[PDB]
Design a protein around this ligand. Structure first.
Ligand code: BCB
Ligand code: BCB
Ligand code: BCB
Ligand SMILES: C/C=C1/c2cc3[nH]c4c(c3C)C(=O)[C@H](C(=O)OC)c4c3nc(cc4[nH]c(cc(n2)[C@@H]1C)c(C(C)=O)c4C)[C@@H](C)[C@@H]3CCC(=O)OC/C=C(\C)CCC[C@H](C)CCC[C@@H](C)CCCC(C)C
Ligand SMILES: C/C=C1/c2cc3[nH]c4c(c3C)C(=O)[C@H](C(=O)OC)c4c3nc(cc4[nH]c(cc(n2)[C@@H]1C)c(C(C)=O)c4C)[C@@H](C)[C@@H]3CCC(=O)OC/C=C(\C)CCC[C@H](C)CCC[C@H](C)CCCC(C)C
Ligand SMILES: CC(C)=CCC/C(C)=C/CC/C(C)=C/CC/C(C)=C/CC/C(C)=C/CC/C(C)=C/CC/C(C)=C/CC1=C(C)C(=O)c2ccccc2C1=O
Ligand code: HEM
Ligand code: HEM
Ligand code: HEM
Ligand code: HEM
Ligand SMILES: CC(C)=CCC/C(C)=C/C=C/C(C)=C/C=C/C(C)=C/C=C\C=C(C)\C=C\C=C(/C)CC/C=C(\C)CCCC(C)C
Ligand SMILES: CCNc1nc(Cl)nc(N[C@](C)(C#N)CC)n1
Ligand SMILES: CCCCCCCCCCCC[N+](C)(C)[O-]
Ligand SMILES: CCCCCCCCCCCC[N+](C)(C)[O-]
Ligand SMILES: [Fe+2]
Lengths: 332, 258, 273, 323
């Protein structure tokens, strides 16, 4: 079980602190090739004539687009999400305004969510932005999603073994380990941290001595909170294909300033972004999805850091189509 | 308010850091470093033409004497004044305090440098039940060589010079620890045995090789006073004799290795 | 000046090199050629430490730190203040350690005893080289070595560990820790027992070799015997680094993921997957 | 070269020795048997072993602890045999995940962990007694029992006393291979980086020092095995050229030296202190220090480095930052 030299190493901290990335060149190249499948931008169309708001019948989101632009978007959407299936994945063959099929309405919300990320989560996605492809990767079900319990394989394009199957109780500890970089940490950071804003990630005191009043008996957070936080960080690390020192100087995890890299602030924003999407776009879709989409407690599949990043510190190595599809945001 | 805070700036842990260090240097300097001085002290030196002092530092660095009561009777008290009365065939090579000494005779038999022994007791080391501890297998009858190992009785002993120097006649066993410690050999062309500690022996199937000394030098290996017994001091004499060969068997052995 | 029994052992001879030239004592210390070079390098290395430290801000001992160069300088010579001092000091340190070791051989020769101690001493020099020299060569930059600072060298160990997510799952480390823990217990047991026999309490008699063997036969069912616990201890101790060296070397040049994932070779056997 | 110091060239066999206890000579069970291979690098006789009450007691409790742990572990892979064997390392028996303060946790949330912790404690107690008694029985001092006590106390510190001191069972050490390891990091993270705990440093200093000392002691005795240096008791009561040579080796190298007895004192002490320092550090943690790095920072200890990548403000403190 070993990976041969050379390793690719970077520096993310002051010399002598052994901070930085440690990359196996072959893995990087293999991920590069997978992400290289990002379809290139459709040729630019000239905006002739009326907004489709006038022209078409049931266009809510992209109503201001001229027709040519609009069909350009519809084409891009098709090759990002449902290329195998074609336009009819979401449309009634004979009535295009028809909302008959759930992919239509789900796709309508996803146009909204997508323009949300690109307009409002600028502090995370910056000027790279996302598109339907960032998550979907050419299939309607995105390959990396989370339910309210751990599931395996992480890539839902792979076929589960018996033990992996969520119904197989004997395989629980492994479903959890594969989510936390193989640790034995008995916590699921997804449901604890990313599904909603209920829990506080920070667990480390900010004073040298114990403050009288929060430091004894039931006043205290249980130590199990520090395990969870560690589990989450194992997960975030494995999700971005990186290590702690990509973000922290481990001298003082709890400190920012010189003890934290810029990417930690960005990750801080991403935790907030992921919670927004889950709480406000993705989780509600359990209303609009077939039962076959939903998990064991009737939850829609939702997003963690892997859903976009899929093992790279910038999703798709920072490829952007933002200037090519302004429909999708930022929306002034 | 904070748990542990004692004053403006001062807290429990910080005071304990100071106690920890104090406990450590106390045990190290005042205890352990004085236990280190139960042998060899007080330091010997040149002498002064006029001096009269119970020199203070020599008192302060010593612990109080302890006495071991010995299992088979007697006691031993350390530290104690344990001077070396024996004459040493050595001469200063140069004048200064740090100069090494040279042997002026045969260092092997003079017992100087790596050939020195300790003035151990002239007593036979005993087992727990009072018997002699280290005895030849001629005496140690209920003992044996484990099946699988060379029995050396019969084998030739071959000295550093490549020359056969004698013939192994017996093994001496430690009956307290069940462990061979010496081979005994008939010395070639002499009417004597020699013990040779097992550490100086490369045991082959066909011979026993001893590189510490040339065949010539086996003749002068220390002799025991009895034949089926050895005293603590004799063990020391025998062992030291071969050890001294490592520096002294030939002229170039004391000189630079390379 | 001399222990009561010392004078008779203080004979010329035994040198690896130099011969009579440095064959003498300064106080209790034997000098010899390597005494001379040990001292040369110490003086160098300590001088550089001072000069370097003076160019820094802090003179607080805990906070002083002399660090290797940025990774970009690779295996090349870095500016003095930017890794160069560290490079110099590392050479002096190696010069001092090896001198100390060869000096120990010369002392062993003069006394007619085995060379086991200078040998045992190669293990920590070796492990120093793994950290400071070999692993950086494999990764291609001096900048992966550890800084010279009482506390800053702990910040390196910390970060190096967390580069691989959880360094505890490193099988070389697990082996290393186990030897660190056994050896500490064994030294307690060996030390405790020799004292218990020689110091029975009240006015009872010093006990015997047979008693030592009986105690451990009684307590754990095996006594390894008097010569062999010294061999064991030298083994257990040495294997702290001899096995550890592998976990250190593997991290980076031969494994780039977190260490828990390495155990996938077990967990993911498809037979039970 | 002294091959004896590598292995025993010729093994001696002789009649089994027994040194009589002041009691319990009749609880020694088993027939001594000999191993030729063992004999090559140690004493060849395995066994007999003394039984006794404290020992049997120790086994009883120990085994009960183990049963509780393994049964909860089996529950974890839902009693699937093969998944049990597969996942054994990852499987654990955890303390309260919830804050019950010092309330007896429910069986499912730490109740079972306490149980096991209790029986293990009694297991250790019983064993300590065995270790203490055999010494007394054989007319020996009790230095070993006193070194062991320190070790047992450390375990109580991390298992019991620290949880009690801060008032939460949630902080105890889980039972399990990886789980007891994950605790190390959970515990260090919560208390501000154990590298910056002075007693963690003392402890390491002594653990490293035990490696230094046992390598140097062991090597020193092998190096004078030719002079019977292994026979350490009689080298104590009647100094021989072995320990004169050992002592002078060390004097000539480092400038001072021990005796053959005192070096075992140095060793006993270094070993003891690993466990003593460690406990003190645990007693101070949570009770009086919350974040060891900040405590160090409070007192001027901590190093500080230039930014390399740009200094990064806590976004949470920004104007307009969400929560
Ligand atoms: C967050 C990171 C962690 C980490 C990271 C870590 C790293 C990165 C490495 C270790 C290594 C090691 N760790 Mg781990 N560690 C260990 C224990 C150990 C050691 C057994 C082992 C070897 C130490 C070493 O290389 O010495 C080195 C000591 C040397 C080289 C001494 C040289 C001395 C020189 C020869 C002479 C010095 C002379 C002075 C200058 C002279 C001064 C003169 C005065 C005195 C007169 C324990 C017991 C634990 C526990 C209980 O949690 C732990 C936790 C962790 N370690 C953390 C999880 N550990 C090493 C290893 O072996 O990994 C497998 C290693 O590479
Ligand atoms: C891979 C992991 C490593 C590691 C991990 C480690 C940890 C995690 C900890 C230490 C600690 C310590 N380390 Mg580090 N370390 C040290 C030295 C030290 C001491 C500052 C201190 C106590 C060590 C001890 O008692 O050993 C046993 C030896 C004994 C008892 C004999 C006395 C040795 C003497 C105390 C050495 C003092 C060295 C001087 C400061 C050096 C100055 C050199 C010149 C100027 C004279 C040296 C000299 C080296 C070298 C040369 O390799 C080294 C390598 C390493 N340490 C590795 C990089 N070490 C502890 C500490 O408290 O840090 C501050 C601690 O917590
Ligand atoms: C990221 C996490 C870290 C960490 C967290 C950590 C914690 C949280 C603790 C330590 C502690 C200690 N650490 Mg640190 N650590 C250490 C080394 C050490 C030890 C010297 C000391 C623990 C004492 C011990 O031997 O326990 C092993 C010995 C034991 C457990 C004795 C057991 C005795 C018992 C009687 C045996 C019983 C066995 C029976 C068979 C039981 C069977 C029962 C059945 C029935 C179940 C090194 C050398 C390093 C390096 C090189 O990086 C390091 C890094 C780190 N540690 C990281 C910073 N470390 C302890 C300490 O000193 O804190 C102050 C401590 O509590
Ligand atoms: C597996 C086996 C082990 C083992 C074995 C043995 N260990 C030995 C022997 C044996 C057998 C000896 O024979 C020899 C000795 O004589 O014993 C008294 C020795 C010795 N073990 C020392 C330190 C020690 N052992 C450590 C570890 C183990 N030991 C492991 C555990 C550690 C750890 C763990 O950190 C330390 C710090 C010295 C006291 C002594 C060398 C003196 C020297 O070499 O003099 C020569 C050099 C000097 C006096 C000063 C040199 C200063 C340089 C030039 C300038 C500074 C350089 C820089 C690197 C500083 C960095 C500081 C920063 C990290 C903070
Ligand atoms: C600094 C010094 C240290 C130090 C010191 C010392 N350490 C000592 C002593 C000293 C001095 C002793 O005198 C004592 C001893 O005796 O030594 C020979 C002992 C010990 N250190 C042990 C383990 C250890 N030390 C560690 C650490 C350190 N130690 C630190 C470093 C570590 C670490 C590193 O993690 C470990 C793991 C044990 C071997 C031993 C206790 C046994 C016990 O307490 O027994 C308790 C009893 C049991 C567990 C019984 C159950 C066993 C059975 C087989 C289970 C069967 C299950 C089955 C279901 C039943 C079926 C029945 C059938 C008939 C139907
Ligand atoms: C003055 C000058 C410039 C001179 C020129 C000559 C010269 C080269 C001098 C060198 C000066 C220098 C550089 C000195 C530094 C000396 C050093 C490196 C000291 C380190 C001392 C330390 C920290 C040791 C750590 C280990 C330790 C805790 C030891 C204490 C106990 C001892 C002394 C153990 C050694 C020891 C062991 C291990 C035995 O087994 C044994 C068995 C039987 C009898 C004696 C012994 C014995 O003494
Ligand atoms: C495939 C290339 C494809 C075509 C062709 C297509 C066309 C299309 C039109 C012209 C409309 C307007 C119909 C009307 O009058 O309301 C329209 C609107 C939406 N589409 Fe579409 N569409 C194609 C493919 C896809 C795919 C693959 C999906 C589902 C992922 C999809 C979804 C939608 C949605 C939602 C709308 C409403 C958009 C809005 O602004 O509200 N289409 N499509
Ligand atoms: C980009 C504007 C975009 C579109 C269009 C889109 C469509 C879409 C569809 C058709 C579904 C339903 C698929 C099904 O058959 O059930 C769907 C579901 C999910 N999506 Fe999506 N999606 C767009 C963008 C994004 C982005 C940027 C992400 C990731 C942040 C994302 C994620 C998901 C997830 C999660 C689901 C729910 C699980 C599922 O129903 O398959 N989408 N999307
Ligand atoms: C690598 C496995 C790793 C560890 C360990 C780690 C730890 C850690 C801790 C202990 C905290 C708590 C801080 C506190 O209590 O104040 C924490 C917090 C954050 N982390 Fe982290 N972290 C690890 C890895 C990573 C990586 C790779 C990144 C950046 C991509 C990262 C980021 C963050 C952020 C952001 C926080 C704060 C969370 C919040 O405020 O909500 N960490 N980490
Ligand atoms: C989940 C909480 C999560 C983490 C953690 C995270 C981190 C992260 C980092 C550190 C960066 C910056 C890397 C760098 O500067 O080198 C980064 C960048 C982007 N992310 Fe992210 N991210 C998390 C989650 C998500 C999710 C769910 C998505 C997709 C909807 C997403 C997207 C992006 C995008 C796009 C970027 C790239 C910005 C760029 O500069 O190229 N992230 N993320
Ligand atoms: C009852 C109340 C109210 C209070 C009690 C207070 C009390 C005394 C509590 C004590 C708590 C304690 C001491 C907890 C300590 C926990 C610690 C330190 C645990 C540390 C490590 C645990 C580990 C490594 C356990 C892992 C798992 C095992 C060893 C598996 C067991 C397997 C076997 C032994 C194999 C058996 C078969 C073999 C003999 C062939
Ligand atoms: C002569 C002293 N004998 C002796 N001494 C010691 Cl320290 N240990 C043992 N035996 C072990 C190491 C234990 N405990 C059993 C594996 N025997
Ligand atoms: C706290 C641990 C359990 C205590 C009870 C264990 C059995 C006690 C046996 C004592 C035997 C007395 N003896 C013979 C050693 O003196
Ligand atoms: C960091 C662990 C504690 C270190 C303690 C080291 C003690 C060795 C001191 C020997 C002092 C020698 N002398 C001659 C000055 O006493
Ligand atoms: Fe010993």
């Amino acid at each position: 079980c070993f990976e041969p030299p050379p390793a690719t190493t970077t520096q993310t901290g002051f010399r002598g602190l052994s901070m930085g990335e440690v990359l196996h060149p072959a893995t990087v190249k293999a991920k590069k090739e997978r992400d290289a499948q990002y379809p290139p931008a459709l040729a630019a169309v000239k905006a002739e004539g009326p907004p489709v708001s006038q022209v078409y019948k049931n266009v809510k989101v992209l109503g201001n687009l001229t027709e040519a632009e609009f069909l350009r978007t519809m084409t891009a959407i098709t090759e990002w999400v449902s290329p195998q299936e074609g336009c009819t994945y979401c449309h009634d063959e004979n009535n295009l305004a028809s909302e008959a099929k759930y992919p239509y309405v789900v796709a309508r919300r996803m146009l909204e969510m997508t323009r949300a990320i690109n307009t409002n989560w600028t502090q995370h996605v910056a000027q790279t932005g996302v598109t339907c492809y960032t998550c979907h990767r050419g299939t309607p079900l995105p390959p990396y999603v989370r339910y309210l319990e751990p599931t395996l394989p992480l890539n839902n394009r792979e076929t589960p073994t018996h033990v992996e199957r969520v119904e197989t109780r004997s395989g629980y500890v492994v479903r959890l380990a594969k989510y936390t970089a193989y640790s034995a940490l008995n916590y699921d950071p997804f449901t604890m941290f990313l599904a909603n804003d209920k829990r506080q990630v920070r667990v480390v005191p900010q004073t040298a001595l114990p403050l009288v009043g929060v430091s004894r008996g039931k006043e205290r957070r249980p130590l199990s909170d520090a395990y969870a936080t560690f589990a989450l960080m194992m997960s975030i690390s494995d999700s971005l294909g990186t290590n702690c020192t990509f973000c922290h100087n481990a001298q003082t995890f709890e400190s920012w300033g010189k003890k934290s890299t810029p990417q930690r602030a960005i990750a801080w924003w991403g935790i907030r972004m992921v919670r927004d999407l889950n709480m406000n776009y993705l989780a509600p879709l359990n209303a609009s999805l077939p039962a076959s989409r939903l998990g064991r407690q009737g939850e829609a599949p939702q997003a963690d850091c892997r859903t976009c990043h899929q093992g790279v510190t910038k999703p798709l190595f920072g490829a952007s189509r933002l200037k090519d599809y302004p429909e999708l945001g930022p929306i002034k | 308010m904070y748990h542990g805070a004692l004053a403006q700036h001062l807290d429990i842990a910080q005071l304990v850091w100071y106690a920890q260090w104090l406990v450590i240097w106390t045990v190290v300097l005042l205890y352990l470093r004085r236990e280190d001085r139960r042998e060899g002290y007080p330091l010997v030196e040149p002498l002064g033409l006029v001096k009269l002092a119970p020199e203070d530092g020599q008192v302060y660095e010593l612990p109080y004497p302890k006495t071991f009561v010995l299992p088979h009777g007697g006691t031993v008290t350390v530290p104690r004044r344990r001077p070396e009365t024996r004459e040493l065939k050595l001469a200063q090579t140069d004048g200064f305090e740090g100069a090494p000494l040279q042997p002026t005779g045969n260092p092997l038999v003079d017992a100087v440098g790596p050939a020195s022994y300790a003035e151990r007791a002239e007593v036979v080391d005993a087992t727990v039940d009072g018997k002699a501890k280290i005895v030849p297998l001629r005496v140690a009858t209920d003992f044996s060589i484990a099946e699988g190992d060379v029995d050396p009785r019969g084998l030739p002993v071959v000295a550093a010079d490549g020359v056969e120097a004698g013939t192994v006649t017996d093994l001496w066993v430690d009956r307290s620890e069940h462990y061979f410690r010496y081979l005994e050999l008939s010395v070639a062309g002499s009417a004597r045995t020699a013990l040779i500690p097992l550490g100086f022996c490369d045991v082959k199937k066909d011979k026993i090789v001893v590189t510490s000394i040339l065949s010539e030098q086996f003749a002068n290996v220390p002799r025991l006073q009895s034949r089926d017994q050895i005293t603590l001091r004799e063990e020391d004499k025998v062992s030291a004799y071969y050890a001294g060969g490592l520096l002294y068997a030939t002229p170039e052995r004391a000189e630079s290795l390379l | 000046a001399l222990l009561s029994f010392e004078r008779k052992y203080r004979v010329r001879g035994g040198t690896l090199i130099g011969g009579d030239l440095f064959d003498f004592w300064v106080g209790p210390y034997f000098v010899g050629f390597f005494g001379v070079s040990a001292i040369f390098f110490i003086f160098l290395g300590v001088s550089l430490i001072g000069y370097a430290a003076s160019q820094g801000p802090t003179w607080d001992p805990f906070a002083i730190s002399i660090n290797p160069p940025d990774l970009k300088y690779g295996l090349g010579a870095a500016p003095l203040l930017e890794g160069g001092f560290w490079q110099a000091i590392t050479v002096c340190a190696l010069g001092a350690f090896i001198s100390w070791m060869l000096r120990e051989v010369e002392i062993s020769r003069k006394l007619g005893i085995g060379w086991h101690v200078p040998l045992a001493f190669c293990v920590p020099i070796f492990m120093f080289c793994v950290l400071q020299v070999f692993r950086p060569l494999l990764l291609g930059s001096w900048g992966h070595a550890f800084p010279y600072g009482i506390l800053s060298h702990l910040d390196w160990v910390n970060n190096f560990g967390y580069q691989y997510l959880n360094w505890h799952y490193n099988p070389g480390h697990m082996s290393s820790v186990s030897f660190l823990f056994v050896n500490a217990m064994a030294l307690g047991l060996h030390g405790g027992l020799i004292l218990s026999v020689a110091n029975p309490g009240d006015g009872d008699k010093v006990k015997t070799a047979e008693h030592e063997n009986q105690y451990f036969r009684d307590v754990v069912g095996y006594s390894i015997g008097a010569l062999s616990i010294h061999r064991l201890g030298l083994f257990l101790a040495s294997n702290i680094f001899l096995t550890g060296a592998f976990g250190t070397i593997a991290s980076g040049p031969f494994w780039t993921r977190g260490w828990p994932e390495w155990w996938g070779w077990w967990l993911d056997i498809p037979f039970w997957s | 070269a002294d091959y004896q110091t590598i292995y025993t060239q010729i093994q001696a066999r002789g009649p089994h020795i027994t040194v009589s206890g002041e009691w319990g000579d009749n609880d020694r069970v088993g027939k001594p048997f000999y191993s030729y291979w063992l004999g090559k690098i140690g004493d060849a006789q395995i066994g007999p072993i003394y039984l006794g009450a404290s020992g049997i007691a120790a086994f009883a409790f120990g085994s009960t602890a183990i049963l509780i742990i393994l049964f909860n572990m089996a529950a974890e892979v839902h009693f699937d045999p093969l998944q049990f064997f597969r996942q054994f390392f990852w499987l654990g028996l955890y303390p309260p995940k919830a804050q019950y303060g010092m309330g007896i946790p429910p069986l499912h949330d730490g109740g079972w962990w306490l149980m096991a912790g209790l029986f293990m404690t009694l297991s250790l107690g019983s064993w300590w007694i065995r270790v203490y008694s055999r010494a007394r029985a054989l007319g020996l001092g009790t230095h070993i029992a006193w070194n062991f006590a320190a070790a047992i106390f450390f375990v109580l510190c991390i298992g019991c006393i620290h949880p009690t001191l801060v008032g939460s069972w949630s902080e105890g050490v889980p039972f399990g291979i990886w789980p007891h390891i994950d605790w190390l990091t959970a515990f260090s993270i919560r208390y501000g980086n154990f590298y910056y705990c002075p007693w963690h440093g003392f402890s390491i200093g002594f653990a490293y020092g035990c490696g230094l000392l046992f390598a140097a002691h062991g090597a020193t005795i092998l190096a004078v095995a030719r002079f019977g240096g292994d026979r350490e008791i009689e080298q104590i009561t009647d100094r021989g050229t072995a320990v004169e040579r050992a002592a002078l080796f060390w004097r000539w190298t480092i400038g001072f030296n021990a005796t053959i007895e005192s070096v075992h004192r140095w060793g006993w002490f270094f070993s003891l202190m690993v466990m003593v320092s460690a406990s003190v550090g645990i007693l101070l943690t949570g009770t009086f220090v919350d974040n060891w790095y900040l405590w160090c920072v409070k007192h001027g200890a901590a190093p500080d480095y230039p930014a390399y990548l740009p200094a990064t403000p806590d976004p949470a403190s920004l104007p307009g930052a969400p929560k």
